[PDB]
Design a protein around this ligand. Structure first.
Ligand code: MET
Ligand SMILES: [Mg+2]
Ligand SMILES: [Mg+2]
Ligand SMILES: [Mg+2]
Ligand SMILES: [Mg+2]
Ligand SMILES: [Mg+2]
Lengths: 124, 141
RNA sequence: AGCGGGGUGGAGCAGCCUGGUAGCUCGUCGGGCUCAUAACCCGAAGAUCGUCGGUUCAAAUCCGGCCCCCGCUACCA
RNA sequence: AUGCCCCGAAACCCCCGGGCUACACGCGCGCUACAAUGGGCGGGACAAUGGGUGCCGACCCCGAAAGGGGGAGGUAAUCCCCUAAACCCGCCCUCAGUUCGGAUCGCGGGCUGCAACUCGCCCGCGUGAAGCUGGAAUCCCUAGUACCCGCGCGUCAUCAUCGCGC
């Protein structure tokens, strides 16, 4: 019942170089990592590593909806902007390889009301 | 010799069809993969399925168990780079169905966007929904 | 309590005597035609048949007891 | 371009993230089909208009494909895009929701870009929805015209079921 990503445990994924990890992700993530990180993602990664070291005991909030979830981010809680607010996301091991924005929906679910005037030919 | 019904891997096959088309009744085997397995097994793809012998059926099922080990390219299987073991696998029947169900369940557990779309029964791959994809009854004004 | 009658889409009848769709008018929803509304034309939803059995290859109704309803009469505590 | 009225430390000027892409439903214009006046596999034929230096790229090598690494010539009647499809020949299927149809979904591989989840395009294997010719109504067209078949340019870093042309 333990977690394995390609036959590797979480600890094995922890002790992997960034280039080595990219060979296990899908094509899109591998290309994105091969081209390097944007400066904003660099700042976010610095904050995450600082929090892991035992410092920065504050909520982590970000605008970087296109950041790829990495194995070293497992166990934290991140607040991703959805357009008007930061929603909390609890990172689980099975989230490796996905963008952050996948967990912060931007639109509200639709519940339809009664059709109005002009909705049909006879109602105009 | 001729048998009007032949059972392969738990599926009954027509005996009057060509082998390449007879094998497509198995869920998880298309026309191309069937031709590949027929050529690997050293059988004429155009032979009637009703002339098979027991050893040939055994060979075909063995090939279907582990196709990669028998010379089929790694890019022709229907589940390469498995999520758990990391190997290249080919699945048929029930195992295929439960693998797909497990993938969708994994998507749903983490509350990903595609998981919500699967739950609500809405298009997943970015289609527009204002005009088409209508399945219901007209509402009156 | 006795006698007679029938229960058929949301409404009103065919449908049983002569067995082969559950059919006919109104109604609800949608579309046509017109610059537009009314009139007019078209399509769809809606009664698995109100329970069992006998008949029949085939009916509900042909018949039978049950479900309740309707009408007339009897009925002096 | 411009009169009047308004805002004039915001209704002006920048940056980040969202939306214009939502979805019980009504409608317009189209594409793909409902198969033999066909589907698949191998082989054989014949164009025109246009465009190219922030670009078109022959030719060689690697890869199953999408693609990748070098790179002649071209500021162009000189080099390149550029050996079209419908059509013809041979074999399989024989009236069936099928060897018809290819919507929907799973896994994997790529390109453009500062960025691909919301929300891009391409490739391999798998899966296999409605649809068996369409009521009342209603549209276009008189000759190289209508029908059928592909191609070029515009938009354009990437993206054509569109517009204008051949
Ligand atoms: C009237 O006669 C009366 N007493 C009859 C019986 S009452 C239950
Ligand atoms: Mg009217
Ligand atoms: Mg729009
Ligand atoms: Mg086909
Ligand atoms: Mg996307
Ligand atoms: Mg047919």
């Amino acid at each position: 019942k333990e977690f394995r990503y390609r036959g590797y445990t979480l600890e094995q994924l922890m002790n992997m170089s960034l280039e080595e990890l990219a060979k296990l992700l899908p094509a899109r993530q591998r290309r994105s990592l091969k081209r390097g990180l944007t400066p904003e993602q660099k700042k976010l990664l610095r904050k995450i590593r600082l929090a892991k070291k035992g410092k920065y005991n504050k909520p982590i909030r970000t605008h970087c909806r296109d950041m790829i979830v990495l194995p070293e981010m497992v166990g934290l809680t991140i607040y991703v902007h959805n357009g008007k607010e930061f929603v909390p996301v609890e990172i689980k091991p099975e989230m490796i390889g996905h963008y952050l924005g996948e967990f912060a929906p931007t639109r509200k679910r639709v519940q339809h009301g009664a059709p109005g005037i002009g909705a049909t030919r006879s109602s105009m | 010799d001729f048998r009007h019904i032949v059972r392969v891997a738990g599926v009954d096959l027509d005996g009057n069809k060509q082998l390449r088309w007879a094998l497509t009744a198995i869920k998880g085997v298309g026309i191309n993969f069937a031709t590949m397995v027929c050529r690997v097994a050293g059988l004429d793809p155009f032979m009637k399925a009703g002339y098979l012998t027991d050893e040939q059926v055994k060979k075909i099922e063995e090939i279907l168990q582990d196709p990669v080990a028998h010379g089929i390219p790694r890019w022709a299987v229907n589940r390469p780079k498995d999520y758990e073991t990391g190997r290249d696998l080919h699945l048929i029947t029930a195992k295929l169905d439960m693998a797909i169900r497990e993938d969708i369940m994994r998507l749903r557990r983490i509350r990903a966007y595609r998981g919500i779309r699967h739950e609500l029964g809405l298009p997943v791959r970015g289609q527009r929904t204002r005009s088409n994809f209508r399945r219901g009854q007209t509402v009156g004004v």
